[PDB]
Design a protein around this nucleic acid. Sequence first.
DNA 1: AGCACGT
DNA 2: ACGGGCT
Lengths: 10, 8
Amino acid sequence: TXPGVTXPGV
Amino acid sequence: XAXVXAXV
DNA sequence: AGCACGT
DNA sequence: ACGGGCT
Ligand SMILES: *C(=O)c1cnc2ccccc2n1
Ligand SMILES: *C(=O)c1cnc2ccccc2n1
Ligand SMILES: [Co+2]
Ligand SMILES: [Co+2]
Ligand SMILES: [Co+2]
């Protein structure tokens, strides 16, 4: 995720 | 068809 | 550690 | 038919 907690996605 | 990690 | 997608 | 991307 995020970052943090890429995206999703990317 | 989707590209969320592969995008086929 | 943290995330499910459709042409 | 297919696996990506940093705080
Ligand atoms: C894209 O729409 C799509 C749907 N199903 C799949 C299954 C397996 C590989 C790629 C796929 N892409
Ligand atoms: C991308 O690398 C990837 C891997 N697994 C998945 C599962 C479900 C939806 C999307 C996905 N993308
Ligand atoms: Co599907
Ligand atoms: Co897979
Ligand atoms: Co991966």
